[PDB]
Design a protein around this nucleic acid. Structure first.
Ligand SMILES: Nc1ncnc2c1ncn2[C@@H]1O[C@H](COP(=O)(O)OP(=O)(O)O)[C@@H](O)[C@H]1O
Lengths: 88, 109, 93, 99, 461, 99, 83, 99, 114
DNA sequence: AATACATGCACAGGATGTATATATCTGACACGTGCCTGGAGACTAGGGAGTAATCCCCTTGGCGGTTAAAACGCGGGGGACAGCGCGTACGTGCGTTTAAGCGGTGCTAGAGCTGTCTACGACCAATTGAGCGGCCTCGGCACCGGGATTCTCCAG
DNA sequence: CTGGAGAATCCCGGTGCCGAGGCCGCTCAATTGGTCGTAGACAGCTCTAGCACCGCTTAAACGCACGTACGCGCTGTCCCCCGCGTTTTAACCGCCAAGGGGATTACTCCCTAGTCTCCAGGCACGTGTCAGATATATACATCCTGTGCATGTATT
């Protein structure tokens, strides 16, 4: 099996394959390949890198240390995806 | 010195107009702000909110609930045409997806 | 502390439209953020109209054309009708 | 005797209908939170979070991937096919107007 | 008043006299109609006290049930063994497991009211509140009454809204931090005399006056030096260890905050985010808890694993020193990863361990405690988490206890301290507890000492 | 005897020639009559400054060129060379101009 | 003087030039009428959004700046014409 | 004359000075000058709107150098942003040191 | 007293080439905030100067590669599209008379290419 | 008078809408500020109507090509058919690890004081930037010639 | 099959050859730089307490792995038909010139309308509290798959 001090599963791979499957059936697709998951993790890392870079820039400008919900609403609004709900 | 009539009570509105005027002045849009401006703007906001909430109330009536949840108004906006076109790049949190399965994926055999 | 919001007015028009219908907490936050976004978009458009026509003020004409711009067809028509009716009510009274 | 296995393409349909008729999240919250903290660690080190911030951009990333899988399924249907593939999301991200 | 001896309803029953005096106290509380707090020291027959109370109740007061007993899940089979060994006439049941055996258990025995006493762990009550709110409970006895430390926990609510007649409490260390623990316990047991915490503060020589204002109506507090007189009191030596070279360079490395290698860049990887004091606790315990402190590993357990933290250095020097001493040793690791590292090390030094991590199932738990407590036992080392292991067990076989790291609360340190000092010991109760310097751990034991001092001024009476 | 070209190479000649050029591929006067024809029913009797008509020709030409580029991407991904109305309908559906 | 059927004045080789700039080799039939519909609805959108600007400015003449602003608010900004 | 046709202020001479700085032997057509002028007006509008929304969000009223710094950190991507921030900070510290 | 000393403009006082005063005036009249800091239009004009310098460098390179001496809109289009970050900054911007980057798809190349 | 494939029920099974209790927690509402909005007036300046100058868009006319329109034929691409095989769906058994509930810190959001130097505003000077005009060099255009890719026989 | 020879148009490139928009030089103006006087946004310094991090506990549902099998993706063939390529025939775009009036647009006076500023008061918010909408549980009828096979026509 495995030996002790079990620290594993690099953090992008923590987004598990049935979660991408559940997102797929939520998106309404009948049948997935076996290669969709890796590039999907790449797409998600790219998108979160852009949005988190904007929110970190916002919170750096306000001289804070805690990313709020308002910072990521401003970051997503500045990208073209206005998120209702959280904050405001 | 007389009784204070709110301008929303003189416009027949339900939205406030003193807050809208204070927002227009402090929001740095122009150095001057007309007196028909906050009345007209609160009228448009009141019509838009009535327009959403009527359809969201119908959708909450379909799912046998009194309350209106984000799923109801999300289905109401994406089910309507014009409100969808107004809110195309707008992601309602806790909203879910309108049900749509493409017809070549049903078995039908 | 003090933080203004459009909660009670949304509740008022909700009770006006449907007299027996509640609303959540998060649906109230969604409607409040929606009203904030729409008002911000219309006010920014009227500001850009006032800059384009070399003006410096915002009267009802600039926001009426901003409503003409921002909304699709029948929604824009009915919002213009509602706004003109309300400003005639305000001026005549 | 003779156990009842469902045909390929039936549990898929019921899964699509069940997950489209719901509105909850799909990604589990603690791996997403640790992923967000590792992305945000790259830009600046000492970053706290709101604990509603991660829920906010979880809803954002979920809506993004749902739209991406939707038009990916669209173009895969267009290719006289049902299974989506890497070229599907590459074409969708290209003509979508992204990188 | 009542039974002036070790009574007759208990079978194989040797009640000591001070426990019988406490029994007279509880029955006088029952006559006065007041919920009380039985909160003396551990190892004073407290489970035998309440078992003797219900053995008096069913026999001479004709109370056949129900009287639930709330325990941590590490004490269910112990309590059921004490019920089956001392007062057998009470119908004895116990509930544990997933929803399937829970449904089977309620469908069998919990519908007709056939039992008399039902021991039940905490989370089982949180899951079966809908079942147990459909009963008329005579008593309510909570063993280890410190899950009710705050009065805002969902367990605290769900035990406050029991439609029941009597409440009784059973803990060892009834004070937790300043006043609000006693406040919440008083607002649980007798809620109709208690309104706000400012009332408790205004009632609080004023400290000893409020102490007797608790002690006379509803409190009982003793120590084994008052009643036992046949045992060593304690035997403690506070030994401080050195800091290894790897320990010191890891300490400077974590104090400059600019350390990691596990990518193309020298990032931080979130490990120095907010709570740097517990990161220094993790450092001072062992650097190998962090990533890559061992080299790019073929996972062998060298002596460099034990010579890279001074606690482990003194520990490896002392385990043959206790082997020639020839008695059972008792290690209490707070961090479970440190317990795993000690598991690897005692496998490397080839002694017999029984790991009590806190995620082990109960069926592999009670038999482990029994095999440690067998007559002429063999399992030399006994590795436990401090909380889920040292909360409520009895370990009178050993005599030396190794408190590896004292946490922020000194009273759970006293609980894991006196686990070995339960009924007393044939030998003396040696304590070899470790402490590292040049860190926050001295501040930990100092704040624990101030908490223990403000507990001591009121716990002397 | 009348030496011909193979079907498929004059199109490549035209592709290199028009991508090298930067002119207006649609002539200007029927485009101007089109713009007046569809502005005839918004407000009657307008005037165009003809830099407006130049700007409209540039905007619609750049828009249609980007549309045909993405449509060509679509009909290549669908294992074809020719483009067909399902490709441009997919291009506007994925890009979001069509709902 | 209202004009009639100028959309079919966008001739087939003009659409072929517009396509062969985009980089397409073979072009099937009946892509043409779809291209007419696309072009017509796009510049209907931008002509409505320009006429509204002109009628707000109280003019009778659509300037190039109204077209530039109407393309700007559509997220399709056009440079060059004196922005 | 003809009422001295109004001062249509634009960015012609500054574009032309910079063009003589980088490529000192290269002219520019007038339509390209209109392109660069519309470009610099658009980019100034983008940075101004971004710094305005930043100063609005922090509930302040003073657009100073820090908000333009974070506005060009938001707008410009990557290496362009870092080089522009370095150049702007150098210009501001020169103007403050020599005022 | 020196009621008008040597009028050293701020573009020469920042070591710049862009109209600091005109940018200050357009920030004041531009309805952007209540007050506008003094260190702001220097930073803004410097950033605009650097961006224009980058675009003109690439346009001059692409025009010299076409042997001409005047930057035309085609050279501006090829300069902005043959660079990644400028393409992402101008991912929506069409320019007039610009043309397209030359790019035939690899599939549409003729078969038996050899 | 038994085989071959097809159509269709039967029924075995599994999910699922629904009937009904009920536990709860969370939205609806009641109250007590107080701070923002309104009443009320002075004002000045931004907009509003007038007015002539004038550029500048719209019609008309001609004509001369250049592009569109129509036609053919065929060759190669789209599309249906079919063969296969392996790649993905589905069911089940272990296992792990998220999730809700604990304690248990303390960093850091956030509110309030408060003093100044920051920008606003105004005056006055003076000069740089827009406009106008002239002029000529870069570039578009055109002939024309020489290379450069393509297509087909045809002798390998 | 098949490279290649050679026509054979296509296209680059060269060399004039006009020509007309950059390009620079006055010009003179609205704008900006210098001075300086106020005032109040923000920098900076408090406290403070809210919530964010962080590990343990204990359940239990999903994730992982594997088995199996079959259904869809891929390739390959045929065919057929329909867009490409070229030729011939129209047609109407574009270039040029000229007129005409009309919107426009910069200047002028004037005048109401939003701003500024006190003074008071009542609607919006924060806090608390409680009952009912719904989340949950369990039970049961109600549909949907699936497929085994009985047979409903065909085959023999
Ligand atoms: N009469 C008696 N004879 C022998 N042993 C006794 C007697 N009474 C109590 N004990 C021992 O003292 C121990 C006290 O344990 P206790 O502290 O009551 O457990 P807890 O900490 O759960 O309350 C019991 O486990 C029992 O073994």
């Amino acid at each position: 099996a495995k030996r002790h001090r079990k620290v594993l599963r690099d953090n992008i791979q923590g987004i598990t394959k049935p979660a991408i499957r559940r997102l797929a059936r939520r998106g309404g697709v009948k049948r997935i390949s076996g290669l969709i998951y890796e590039e999907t993790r790449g797409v998600l890392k790219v998108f979160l890198e852009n949005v988190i870079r904007d929110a970190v820039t916002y919170t750096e400008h306000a001289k804070r240390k805690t990313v709020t919900a308002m910072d990521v609403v401003y970051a997503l609004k500045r990208q073209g995806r206005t998120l209702y709900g959280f904050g405001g | 010195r007389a009784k204070a009539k709110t301008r929303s009570s003189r416009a027949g509105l339900q939205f406030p107009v003193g807050r809208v005027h204070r927002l227009l002045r402090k929001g740095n849009y122009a150095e001057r702000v007309g007196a028909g401006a906050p009345v007209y703007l609160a009228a448009v906001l009141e019509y838009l909110t009535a327009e959403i909430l009527e359809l969201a109330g119908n959708a909450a009536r379909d799912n046998k609930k009194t309350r209106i949840i984000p799923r109801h108004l999300q289905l109401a906006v994406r089910n309507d045409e014009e409100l969808n076109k107004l809110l195309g790049r707008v992601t309602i949190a806790q909203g879910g997806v309108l049900p749509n399965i493409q017809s070549v994926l049903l078995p039908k055999k | 502390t003090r933080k203004e919001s459009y909660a009670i007015y949304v509740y008022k028009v909700l009770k006006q439209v449907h007299p027996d219908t509640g609303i959540s907490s998060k649906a109230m936050s969604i409607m409040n953020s929606f009203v904030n976004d729409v008002f911000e978009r219309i006010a920014g458009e009227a500001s850009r109209l006032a800059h384009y026509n070399k003006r410096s003020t915002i009267t009802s004409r600039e926001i009426q054309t901003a409503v003409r711009l921002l909304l699709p067809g029948e929604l824009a028509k009915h919002a213009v009708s509602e706004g003109t009716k309300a400003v005639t009510k305000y001026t005549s009274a | 005797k003779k156990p009842h296995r469902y045909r390929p393409g039936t549990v898929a349909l019921r899964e699509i209908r069940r997950y489209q008729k719901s509105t909850e999240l799909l990604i589990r919250k603690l791996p997403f939170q640790r992923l967000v903290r590792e992305i945000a660690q790259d830009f600046k080190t000492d970053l706290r979070f709101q604990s509603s911030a991660v829920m906010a951009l979880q809803e954002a990333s979920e809506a993004y991937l749902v739209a991406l899988f939707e038009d990916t399924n669209l173009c895969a249907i267009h290719a006289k096919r049902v299974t989506i593939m890497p070229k599907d999301i590459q074409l969708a991200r290209r003509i979508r107007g992204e990188r | 008043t009542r039974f002036e001896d070790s009574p007759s309803y208990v079978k194989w029953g040797k009640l000591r006299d001070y426990q019988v005096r406490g029994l007279n106290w509880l029955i006088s509380l029952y006559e006065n109609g007041i919920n009380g707090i039985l909160a003396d020291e551990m190892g004073l027959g407290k489970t035998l006290q309440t078992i003797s109370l219900l053995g008096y109740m069913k026999h001479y007061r004709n109370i056949p049930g129900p009287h639930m007993v709330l325990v941590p899940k590490s004490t269910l089979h112990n309590w059921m063994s004490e019920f089956k060994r001392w007062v057998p006439t009470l119908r004895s049941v116990c509930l544990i497991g997933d929803k399937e055996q829970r449904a089977a258990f309620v469908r069998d025995v919990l519908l007709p009211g056939e039992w008399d006493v039902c021991v039940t762990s905490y989370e089982m009550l949180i899951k079966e509140k809908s079942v147990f709110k459909k009963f008329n409970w005579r008593y309510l006895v909570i063993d280890e009454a410190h899950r009710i430390k705050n009065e805002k926990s969902k367990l605290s609510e769900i035990v406050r809204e029991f439609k029941t007649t009597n409440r009784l409490l059973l803990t060892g260390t009834p004070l937790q931090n300043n006043l609000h623990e006693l406040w919440s316990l008083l607002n649980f047991l007798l809620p109709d005399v208690f309104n706000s915490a400012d009332d408790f503060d205004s009632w609080f020589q004023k400290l000893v006056e409020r102490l007797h204002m608790v002690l006379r109506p509803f409190l009982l507090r003793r120590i084994k030096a008052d009643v036992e007189k046949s045992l060593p009191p304690k035997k403690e030596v506070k030994i401080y260890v050195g800091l290894s070279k790897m320990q010191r360079e890891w300490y400077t490395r974590i104090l400059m905050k600019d350390i990691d290698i596990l990518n193309s860049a020298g990032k931080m990887d979130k490990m120095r985010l907010l709570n740097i004091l517990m990161q220094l606790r993790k450092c001072c315990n062992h650097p190998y808890l962090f990533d890559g402190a061992e080299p790019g590993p073929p996972y062998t357990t060298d002596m460099h694993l034990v010579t890279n933290s001074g606690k482990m250095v003194v520990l490896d020097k002392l385990l043959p020193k206790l082997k020639e001493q020839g008695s059972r040793v008792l290690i209490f690791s707070q961090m479970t990863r440190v317990l795993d590292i000690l598991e690897d090390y005692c496998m490397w030094r080839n002694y017999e361990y029984c790991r009590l991590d806190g995620q082990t199932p109960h069926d592999e738990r009670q038999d482990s405690i029994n095999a440690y407590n067998e007559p002429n036992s063999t399992k030399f080392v006994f590795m436990l988490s401090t909380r889920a292991g040292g909360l409520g067990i009895n370990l009178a076989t050993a005599d030396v206890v190794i408190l590896y790291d004292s946490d922020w609360n000194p009273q759970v340190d006293l609980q894991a301290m006196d686990r070995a000092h339960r009924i007393g010991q044939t030998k003396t109760v040696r304590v070899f507890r470790f402490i590292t310097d040049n860190t926050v751990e001295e501040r930990i034991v100092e704040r624990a000492e101030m908490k223990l001092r403000l507990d001591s001024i009121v716990i002397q009476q």
